[PDB]
Design a protein around this nucleic acid. Structure first.
Ligand code: K
Ligand code: MG
Ligand code: MG
Ligand code: MG
Ligand code: MG
Ligand code: MG
Ligand code: MG
Ligand code: MG
Ligand code: MG
Lengths: 80, 80, 134, 88
RNA sequence: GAGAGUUUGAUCCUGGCUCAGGACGAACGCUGGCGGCGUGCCUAAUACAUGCAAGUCGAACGAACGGAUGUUAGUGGCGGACGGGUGAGUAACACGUGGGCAACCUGCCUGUAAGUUGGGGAUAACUCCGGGAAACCGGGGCUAAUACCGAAUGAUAAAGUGUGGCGCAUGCCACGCUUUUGAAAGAUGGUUUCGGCUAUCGCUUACAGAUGGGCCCGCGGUGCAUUAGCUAGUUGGUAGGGUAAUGGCCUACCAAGGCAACGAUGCAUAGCCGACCUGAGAGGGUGAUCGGCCACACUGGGACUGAGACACGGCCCAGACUCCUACGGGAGGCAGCAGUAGGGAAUCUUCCGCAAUGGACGAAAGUCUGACGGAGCAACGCCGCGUGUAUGAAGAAGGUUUUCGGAUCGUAAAGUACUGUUGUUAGAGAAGAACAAGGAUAAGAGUAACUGCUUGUCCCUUGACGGUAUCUAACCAGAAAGCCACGGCUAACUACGUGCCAGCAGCCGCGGUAAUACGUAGGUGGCAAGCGUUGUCCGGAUUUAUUGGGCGUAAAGCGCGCGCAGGCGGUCUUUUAAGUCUGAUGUGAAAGCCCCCGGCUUAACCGGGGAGGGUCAUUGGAAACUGGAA
C-alpha cells in the first residue's frame, strides 16, 4: 500500500486470518469426526455431538461463524 | 396478517413432477392505439400430489420460491 | 389502416437526413472507428484548391477547396468572399452551408478562424468574412 | 448512526436550513428519512419552525441531534420536554 | 391548435423543400462596461509530471524523549465499505411504481432485563546477530494490555418435549418442564475505613425498536424476423450439503421437460428514474448540472479482514503500461481536487479556510476532511444597470443626395442649465456566530453520600470569505456601442463602382453597361453588451394521421383463390365479475412545472404552504356493454 493505515490493516487481517482459519479447521475436523462416527453408528458419537456443539457455539462467540449457521449445523448433526 | 397475491387460470401441461403451469389470460389496453389486447402470462404452480390435469380451471397463490421458476402454489381447483 | 393493423405494426416515421453528415461524425485513432457526435464546425487540411463552373443559370467561377477533415472525410468547401490566403496543405475551419449554384459543395469555410486570413478591403458584414474593425 | 441535523439549502452568501432526520452516512444535502423543521440564522431572532412531536419521537427512537440542533431544541424548550418524558 | 413563399401561361388539388417561434453543457466570426444568481472534457473509461484528497485515540498497552504536564515510532480499537468520481459495461427484477419474506440479516443509536468472576500462554516495540548503500528483511532473547486462549455460573441457540390461541399449504405466537452448549475488560474519578461502595466511557447475553441492506414477485418503459428456433443443471422431483436466508445455489439419482410468432435466441444501441426542452394536447427528443437507485475504479479472476467489500486511493495472482535504481532489486494505477500532454469546434485555478453545515476518531480540548464553504477564470447562460438628462433652429461646418431650388443626417451638434446609477478619491464598516469546551450555579433520577449524569439560566469564547457587500462625502459628462439585415417570404432605399466578371443566396433566385438582390458610402429597420452564422431537438409537418390521413386517374388493392393462427362476430333469459364503472385506505420522495404568500434596492434567485401527476395496489359494491359459462 501507500497509506499509513492500509499496511496496518493488512497486518491485522493476516493475523486474524491465521487465527480464524485455525479455529474453523478445528471446528470442521470435529464435525467430520462426529459424522464419520455417526455413519459407523458408534458409542462415541453422543459425546462428539457435544464436542461439535461446544466448538460451534464457541466459534459464534468468537465471531468466526454466524449463530443461525451454528444452530443449523447443530440441527443437522442432531438429525444423525 | 399481511396478505399475498392470488390468481386464477387454466392448466396447459402436466409433464412436470408435483406441479403444473397455470396460464392467466387478461384483456388489457394497448398503450397508444387504445385497443384491448389479450395478454397472457403463465406461472408454475406447486401441486403437492399431481392432482390437476390439462384443461383444468384453477386458483393459485404466491409463496416463497420453490425452484428456479416456481414462486406460486395451488390453492383450489375451481372447475375441472 | 385498421387498429389491429396499427397494433400488429405501429407507425414508423421518416428517416431524417442531415444537411451536414461529416460534421456529425467524430474519430478516435485508437479504435479506428467513427463516433457519432453532433458538431458545428471541423478543421481540415486543403488537399486541392480550384474553380468551378456552376449550374445554369449562372456562369461565374466559384472558388472551392477539397479538404481532408479531422475525421478523415474528404469534402469540398466553398471559399466565400473576395480573394483568399489558401493553397495546398493549408489548414482551414469549416462550417455547414450549401452552395446552391454548385453541385458537389455542401459546406463553407469560416473566414478568419485559422490560416484562412480575412477578406481584403471589406467594410460591411465584417463578422462574416472575418475582417476586424479598422 | 441516525441523526437530526441541518440540510443546507438556499443560495450563496444567503443560506437557509431545513431541519432533517438522516443517517450519519448520507450526504449533507442527500436523502433523508423525514424533515421536520426549518432554520435561518440571518434574522435578529433566528426563525425556527419545528413540529416537536415527531422530533420527540425520533429522539425516543434514538435519533440524536447535532450541537446547534440540540441548542435550537433547548431554546425551543424541547430538550427539557424530552428529559421530562425520560423522567418516567 | 394562425400561417407564408416555392411547380403553372394561369387555376384547383396532391406532394415535397424552406421560413416566421422556442431551446442548447455549445463552438466560431465582429465587438465588448459593470453587478447579482447559475453553468463550464459532451470528444480519448486515452496516458499521468507534481502537490494535497483518511485519519484518529496517551482516559487501551509497554518503551523512549522530559524537569510533574507534554511529546512521540510501535502493539491494540474504531473508521477506512462514508464522503468524493465517472457512465465503460449492462436490454435485465438493472431501474420506476406497487406488494411479499410464515424464507432473511443489521456495528455505531435508543430503551428494557441480567452480568464484567477468577487464571494461563505468548507476541510486537526493544536489544543483539547476519544480509543489504540505507530503508527494509530475516534468526535469537526480553516484555504490557480494552490483543489472544481456557474455565464456572447465564440462553427467548440446539435436542426431547408437552399445554393455550391461531394462519396462507410450507406453518406462526405465547407459556412451562427436562437435557446439552455459549461471556466478558478494563480505563478514568470520587468517596470511604483500610474491606468496600460508586458516577461516566467501555465490554458480554437476550429482547424490542429505529436506521441501513438482502431475496422474491405483478406490471411498465428499444430498433431489427435482410435474426425463428433456443436451452442440456437446461425444467421438475426425492435425498444431501451451502448462504445472514428461500431456491439447481451446488452435488447425486429419476423422469424429459421448459421457453417461444403475446417475438423467445441472436446482433447493434443504451445506465434507469425524478425530471429537462418543445408542443393546444396526445405525443416527439434528451437523460448536462440538482436528488434517488444501479454498475464500474488500467483489464481479468479470487479470496482474507470485517456488522457491512469480494474494497477508488486494500491484498494475492495473471496480463498490458510506466517509473526509480547503488543494476542486487524495488514501486505504481487521477473516472478524488487542481493541473499536464494528446485528441478535439471546444470547455476553469497546480488558489484560501475548516469560520459554517456535515462526517471519521476521541471522555473531551482537538485533529482530519480538495466533502463542503468560499475566492479565481470564461459574455457560456438568466436577470439587472449603464454607456448621460433637460433645453436648444426653418436648421451651423461637414457627409450623402440634388428634380442644383432644395431634401436628409438633425435638437443631433454648438451653446446654457442639471445629475452622479457607474468610474475615481478619501472615510466608516454589518449579517453570517450557533455554539462546543470551560466557570458558575437552581431542580431532578440514581446514590451510604460524593464524583458524575440529565435539564434550566447566566458568563466566556472563535470569521476563510474580508476591511467583501453595504453606507457617507468630494470630483469629473467626463473614460464606457457594437452586430446584422433593407427584392419578396419579412421590418427597413438612394448614390456611385462593377458589368453572367467580381461576387450574393434559408426557399424563390440576383449580376451580360441605368443592379433598392454584388462591393462601398450615406440613410433606414431590427436588436443591443451583445448580434449573426453553423450544428442539434420539438413545433409549424394531419409529412406516420389514437386524437388525426389515404390507395379509379396523383404514391398506394397482393393477379386470383383454398385456408391454419389471430382479429371481429345475429336475437333473448340466467350466472359471474376477466375487461369496464364506482366508495374507502395507503403510497407515487425532496427539488422542478402550476397556484398562493414572504424575502434579497426589483429581477434573476431563494424560502413557506398547497395542488397535480399512476392503463398504481388492496379492500368493498353495479351488471348496461365486451368477455367466460349453462
Ligand atoms: K441455473
Ligand atoms: Mg454506453
Ligand atoms: Mg402538433
Ligand atoms: Mg477502499
Ligand atoms: Mg486513485
Ligand atoms: Mg482530475
Ligand atoms: Mg450600377
Ligand atoms: Mg397510381
Ligand atoms: Mg415532489
Amino acid at each position: 500500500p501507500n497509506i499509513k493505515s492500509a499496511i496496518k490493516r493488512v497486518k491485522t487481517a493476516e493475523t486474524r486470518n491465521s487465527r480464524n482459519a485455525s479455529q474453523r479447521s478445528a471446528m470442521r475436523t470435529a464435525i467430520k469426526k462426529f459424522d464419520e462416527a455417526a455413519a459407523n453408528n458408534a458409542d462415541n458419537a453422543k459425546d462428539l455431538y457435544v464436542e461439535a456443539s461446544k466448538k460451534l457455539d464457541s466459534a459464534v462467540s468468537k465471531g468466526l461463524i454466524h449463530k443461525n449457521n451454528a444452530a443449523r449445523n447443530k440441527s443437522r448433526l442432531a438429525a444423525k | 396478517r399481511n396478505q399475498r397475491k392470488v390468481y386464477t387460470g387454466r392448466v396447459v401441461s402436466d409433464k412436470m413432477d408435483k406441479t403444473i403451469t397455470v396460464v392467466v389470460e387478461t384483456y388489457k389496453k394497448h398503450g397508444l392505439y387504445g385497443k384491448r389486447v389479450k395478454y397472457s402470462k403463465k406461472f408454475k404452480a406447486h401441486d403437492e400430489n399431481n392432482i390437476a390435469k390439462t384443461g383444468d380451471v384453477v386458483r393459485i397463490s404466491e409463496t416463497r420460491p420453490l425452484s428456479a421458476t416456481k414462486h406460486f402454489r395451488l390453492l383450489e381447483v375451481v372447475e375441472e | 389502416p385498421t387498429i389491429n393493423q396499427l397494433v400488429r405494426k405501429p407507425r414508423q416515421s421518416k428517416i431524417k437526413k442531415s444537411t451536414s453528415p461529416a460534421l456529425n461524425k467524430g474519430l478516435n485513432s485508437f479504435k479506428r472507428e467513427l463516433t457519432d457526435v453532433n458538431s458545428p464546425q471541423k478543421r481540415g487540411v486543403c488537399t486541392r484548391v480550384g474553380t468551378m463552373t456552376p449550374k445554369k443559370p449562372n456562369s461565374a467561377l466559384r472558388k472551392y477547396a477539397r479538404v481532408r477533415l479531422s475525421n478523415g472525410i474528404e469534402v469540398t468547401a466553398y471559399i466565400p468572399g473576395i480573394g483568399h490566403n489558401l493553397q495546398e496543405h493549408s489548414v482551414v475551419l469549416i462550417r455547414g452551408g450549401r452552395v446552391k449554384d454548385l453541385p458537389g459543395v455542401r459546406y463553407h469555410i469560416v473566414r478568419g478562424a485559422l490560416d484562412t486570413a480575412g477578406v481584403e478591403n471589406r467594410g460591411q458584414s465584417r463578422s462574416k468574412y472575418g475582417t476586424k474593425k479598422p | 448512526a441516525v441523526k437530526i441535523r441541518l440540510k443546507r439549502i438556499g443560495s450563496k452568501k444567503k443560506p437557509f436550513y431545513r431541519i432533517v432526520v438522516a443517517d450519519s452516512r448520507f450526504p449533507r444535502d442527500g436523502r433523508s428519512i423525514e424533515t421536520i423543521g426549518t432554520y435561518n440564522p440571518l434574522l435578529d431572532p433566528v426563525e425556527v419552525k419545528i413540529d416537536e412531536e415527531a422530533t420527540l419521537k425520533w429522539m425516543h427512537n434514538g435519533a440524536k441531534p447535532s450541537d446547534t440542533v440540540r441548542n435550537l431544541l433547548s431554546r425551543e424548550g424541547i430538550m427539557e420536554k424530552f428529559h421530562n418524558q425520560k423522567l418516567g
